[PDB]
Design a protein around this ligand. Structure first.
Ligand SMILES: [Zn+2]
Lengths: 180, 165
């Protein structure tokens, strides 16, 4: 799984910082080692190193052997799940967040919907009117990224999709290696 | 012993100066201002400090190069790094600067080529290291990344199950 080593490296580089990554580079080698040997090689501080390993343990990137004496090894395949969860993450972003049909009162900066128009309208003025602060409501472009900002994030997402494509292709071949 | 340390320190400075030319004991006594240390101590030096010395370099019939013995190539560990199993070597910044030339001048060019600095020998202390493939997605990155620490929160073989269905 030489390609898997690059995909893992890629993913670590974009996500976690270099303090994690240097230890992570050794973990990428994947071998059963003792904390002391890993401490001698790295010369990191024991406390921060344990913070890193535990954060990784939280990721389930790591597995252990309890001899007490403790030894650490890489669980490898927390990768398929990691890819999948990220896609949902990327997708939720791709899911619409802009409440369409959607008026707001520029005075109270609160939000209301299309349905709330049928109750916030007043016939005496022939226009809409907020509840607790009687003022005309307009648009919605607040807190939720503007129409032109929407385009910028949707394109950014659209730009994100290809750059993780090869990784999926790596994953596709890895999953084929797991069919066998 | 103290006197011997002054020999070590002098020699250390001379190595640091860039030279490893050997000298006679007498000259070293003189340059360390320890000429009148006496026959006895000199003899102790000759029959322990200079011969029982685990890393003394004898060359040209004279004693040289005491501070160091582990590294002589004075260059990046290309051979050490090339290996896929024995790769490595986080090293002290002060060790690299002492070995030959100050790091900082090569580093300013190196900082976007072959060297990486991490704060680790205390936050003031610095370790030298290196890199390889790009980042994955342009983005604010730190904001998305901080919403992506997965869920190291259980029922996760079941969250992939749920996610597949
Ligand atoms: Zn209002």
């Amino acid at each position: 799984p030489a390609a898997l080593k690059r995909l893992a490296k890629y993913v670590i580089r974009g996500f976690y910082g270099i303090e994690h990554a240097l230890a992570l580079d050794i973990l990428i080698r994947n071998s059963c080692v003792k904390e002391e040997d890993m401490l001698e090689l790295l010369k990191f501080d024991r406390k921060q190193l344990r913070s890193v390993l535990n954060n990784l343990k939280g990721d389930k990137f790591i597995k252990c052997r309890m001899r007490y004496f403790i030894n650490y090894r890489t669980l490898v395949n927390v990768v398929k799940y990691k890819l999948d969860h990220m896609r949902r993450r990327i997708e939720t972003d791709e899911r619409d967040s802009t409440n369409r049909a959607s008026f707001k009162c520029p005075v109270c900066s609160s939000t209301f919907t299309d349905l709330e128009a049928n109750q916030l309208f007043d016939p005496m003025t022939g226009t809409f009117r907020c509840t607790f602060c009687h003022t005309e409501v307009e648009e919605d472009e607040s807190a939720m990224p503007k129409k032109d900002a929407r385009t910028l994030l949707a394109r950014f997402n659209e730009q994100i999709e290809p750059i993780y494509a090869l990784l999926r292709e790596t994953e596709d071949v890895n999953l084929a290696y797991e069919i066998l | 012993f103290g006197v011997l340390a002054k020999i070590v320190n002098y020699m250390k400075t001379r190595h640091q100066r860039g030279d490893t030319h050997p000298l006679t004991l007498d000259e070293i006594l003189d340059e360390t201002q320890h000429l009148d240390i006496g026959l006895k101590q000199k003899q102790w030096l000759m029959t322990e400090a200079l011969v029982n010395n685990p890393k003394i370099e004898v060359i040209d019939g004279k004693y040289a190069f005491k501070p160091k013995y582990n590294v002589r190539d004075k260059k990046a560990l290309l051979r050490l790094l090339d290996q896929h199993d024995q790769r490595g070597l986080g090293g002290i910044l002060l060790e690299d600067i002492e070995e030959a030339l100050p790091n900082s001048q090569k580093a300013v060019k190196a900082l976007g080529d072959q060297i990486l600095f991490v704060n680790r020998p205390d936050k003031k202390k610095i370790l030298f290291f290196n890199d390889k493939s790009c980042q994955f997605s342009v983005d604010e990155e730190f904001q998305k990344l901080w919403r992506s620490v997965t869920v190291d929160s259980m029922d996760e073989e079941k969250i992939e199950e749920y996610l597949k269905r």
